[PDB]
Amino acid sequence: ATFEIVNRCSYTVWAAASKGDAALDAGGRQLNSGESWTINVEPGTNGGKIWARTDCYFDDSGSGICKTGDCGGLLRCKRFGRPPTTLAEFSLNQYGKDYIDISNIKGFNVPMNFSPTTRGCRGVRCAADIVGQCPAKLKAPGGGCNDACTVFQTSEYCCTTGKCGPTEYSRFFKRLCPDAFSYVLDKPTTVTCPGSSNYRVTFCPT
């Protein structure tokens, strides 16, 4: 499957792609404003994610830091990134179908559209100014808008009992972005696409 990752932001982002225990394709790449990166993701990939990282510094060997979404200090991510991170999430060729969503469960850093480039399903988008509107207690000093689990580490915000409800914080993410997961047990906003669809993730779509 082909994913075109496009940076429409006015600022540089360092794209990342991982399934948590391994890189997808090269795992990460710097994208200046307007740059695109086409990656290939193996069919059957389960639990893949793509995200943006901001304000990164890397040395010649690809080691360094990012202010949002840092993945163990690597340019070429092999694991998931440090919140806050708006997440494009996908599982491919799962009983003949693909499943896509955007999630704010790990906070929000950069606005995103995640759309098929092939027929048979719709895209999802979270492009509201969540960082600008972020509740004071969720603001990350390193940049971005933290989820409440990251901030407070409670069973209710983290849904670690499998019994949690919406919260004042999850409702903020949901109000700004109805089409993205706002907490672990949110009513799903997952889209079902034909198996072996192709996609585009656009940072700062609007």
Side-chain angles (χ1 to χ4, degrees), residues 23 54-55 67 77 95 98 163 169 195 201:
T54 61
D55 309 316
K67 291 212 179 151
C77 294
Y95 301 102
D98 292 357
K163 290 97 173 181
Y169 295 123
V201 175

Side-chain angles (χ1 to χ4, degrees), residues 17-66:
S18 173
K19 62 176 187 78
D21 57 0
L24 299 176
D25 201 286
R29 183 174 286 193
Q30 183 177 321
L31 297 178
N32 290 179
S33 175
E35 292 186 344
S36 303
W37 176 36
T38 298
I39 65 168
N40 291 274
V41 174
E42 186 180 43
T45 289
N46 182 74
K49 303 186 196 304
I50 287 162
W51 67 104
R53 302 171 282 171
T54 61
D55 309 316
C56 307
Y57 297 92
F58 296 106
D59 65 24
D60 296 330
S61 72
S63 289
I65 193 168
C66 299

Side-chain angles (χ1 to χ4, degrees), residues 167-181:
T167 65
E168 199 165 309
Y169 295 123
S170 75
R171 288 186 183 93
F172 157 77
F173 288 96
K174 198 65 169 183
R175 173 171 68 83
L176 276 274
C177 282
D179 205 25
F181 282 86

